[PDB]
Amino acid sequence: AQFPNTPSFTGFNTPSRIEADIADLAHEGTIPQGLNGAFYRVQPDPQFPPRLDDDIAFNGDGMITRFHIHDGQVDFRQRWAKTDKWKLENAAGKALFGAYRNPLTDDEAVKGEIRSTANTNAFVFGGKLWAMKEDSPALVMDPATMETFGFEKFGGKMTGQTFTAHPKVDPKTGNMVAIGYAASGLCTDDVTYMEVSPEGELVREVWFKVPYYCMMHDFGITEDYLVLHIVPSIGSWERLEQGKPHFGFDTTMPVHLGIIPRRDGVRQEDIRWFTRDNCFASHVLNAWQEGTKIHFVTCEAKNNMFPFFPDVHGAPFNGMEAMSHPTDWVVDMASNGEDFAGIVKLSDTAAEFPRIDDRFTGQKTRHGWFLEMDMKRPVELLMNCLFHKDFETGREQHWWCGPVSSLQEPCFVPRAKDAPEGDGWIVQVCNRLEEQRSDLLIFDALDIEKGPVATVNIPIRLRFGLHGNWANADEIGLA
Ligand SMILES: [Fe+3]
Known part of the structure; x- marks a missing residue:
């Protein structure tokens, strides 16, 4: 097929569309024997040229990559997520x-x-295996064969139209915690709060309303609460009618933080809202309760981070104000009123794609890992560093991928089920941009600054990825 000659379909964004299997990828260094499981990640990758002359990257069909790490080797499998859309378009050609x-x-x-x-x-x-996109139910797949089952509607028990792409697992119950915004239709202000049991049952779906419709891409959980930030990347049917991108950022609107109790029968009146001045925040590192306080750590920027969802009043994109930093939003459930208790910048390092040791979701975490944008580094062709923060000692570690590469989201892999927080590895894809290929990097998670302990060569150029996760072999039918 003939694709558009635009930035979204050329250079690093050239369509790939490869399904493949490779056993025992070539590598440098030592692949830890303790790894036994798989790292899954997804890249938007268009099956067909777009209907309109120039689509965006966020809109490509999901292609799922799995790195099966076992016995000191890495195997590679890549398969389409066969959504209804994929199937319909495949049939129609x-x-x-x-x-x-x-x-x-x-x-x-x-x-x-x-x-x-x-x-x-x-x-x-x-x-x-859940292949997720926040405008629809999640697609479920077999984690071992990577065949597609279909959309997870919980047998029809799900009454909302949508399911998040940023699920959180509650370590105490083992439930997946999820939201679904635009729950009654596009651009609506209805949201569901859901929990799924380890056995796959939808055990709670609570409908509520938010102050305004916006991109509710991420959220946090604590022991007792779901913590939902309301940030004015807004959309509307009118925007679509006027031919605009669905979302645009409004610098004049307030930001809110909603505290939803994680219990049966929660009502709108049970939800508490805090309000602050305008900013941009998308991803949540983690959240936790401490005394009467809720700590909500996010990557906050002064202004919009999505150039393709532009300022609603016509302002050109401001790259400097798009720089995000790990920031603790603190609210006090024992206070009166809507003011935040604190907004605390936690590093001067510009960072996004935040990750924790997910075994500690909803509890106070000592460690965080991020993609860093170090504008001081040489560039010879931007997420060019892996960044680790020890929030107890304050110590920051950085690893730079060099002047002709960039990095994809990291993922933490525990050494053992009983290992302390952060005792384990970081895995992440590295884009070798000049060489037109990709590596899988494996780091010791608490000493990233010494560099990866193994560099695993992928002889296929991977495209821009979004989010990814590790699972142990006995969780994915590969034991
Ligand atoms: Fe995300």
Whole structure:
């Protein structure tokens, strides 16, 4: 097929569309014998050229990559996430769905169909692989064969239209905690709060309303609460009618933080809202309670981080104000009123794609890992560093991938089920941009600054990834 000659489909964004298997990737260094499991990640990768002359990267069909690490070797498997969209378009031999989150640009033949590309997260839970996209139910797949089952509607018990791509697992119960925004239709202010049991049952779906419709991409959990930030990357049917990107950022609107009790029968009146001045924040490192306080650690920027979801009043993109920093938003449940208790910048390092040792989700975490944008580094062609913060000692570690590479989201892998927090490894894809290929890097998680202990060569150029996760072999049918 002939694709557009635009930045979204050329250079690093050239379509790939490869399904493949490779055993025992070539490598340097020593692949830890203690790793036995798999790292899953997803890349948007268009099956067909877009209906409109220039689509964006966030809109490509989900292609799932798995790195099966065992016995000191890494095997590679890549397969399509076979969404209804993928299947419909494969049958038709052409694109049928249009622009990002814009049903007014779809073929009449797919009116009412689920629009998911399942392209944002590859998450393992309850014996299934979840290929996730926040405008639809999640797609479920077999984590071992990577065949596709279909969308998870919980047998029809799910009443909302959508499911998050940033699920959190509660370490105490083992439940997946999820939201679904735009729950009653596009651009609505209805949201669901859901929990899924380890056995796969939807055990709670609570409907509530938020102050305004916006991109509710991420959230936090604590022991007793779901913590939902309301940030004004807004959208509307009118925007779609006027031919604009679904979302745009409004610098004049306030930011809110909602505290939803994680219990049966929660009502709107049970939800507490805090309010602060405008900023941008997308990803959540973690959240926790301490005394009467809730600590919500996010990557906050002064202004919009999505150039493709532009300022709603026509401002050009401000790259300097898009720089995000790990920041603790602190609210006090024993206070009166809506003011935050604190907004505390935690590092001067510019960072995003935050990760923790997920075994400690919802509890106070000593460690965080991030992709860092170090604008001081040489560049000979930008997420160019891996960044680790020890929040107890304050010590920061950095590893730079060099002047002709960039990095994808890291993932923490525990050494053992009983290992202390952060005792284990970091895995991440590295884009060798000049060489037109990719590496899988493996680090000792608490000494990233010495460099990866193994560099695993991938003889296939991977595309831009979104989110990824590790699961142990006995969780994915590979033991
Ligand atoms: Fe995300």
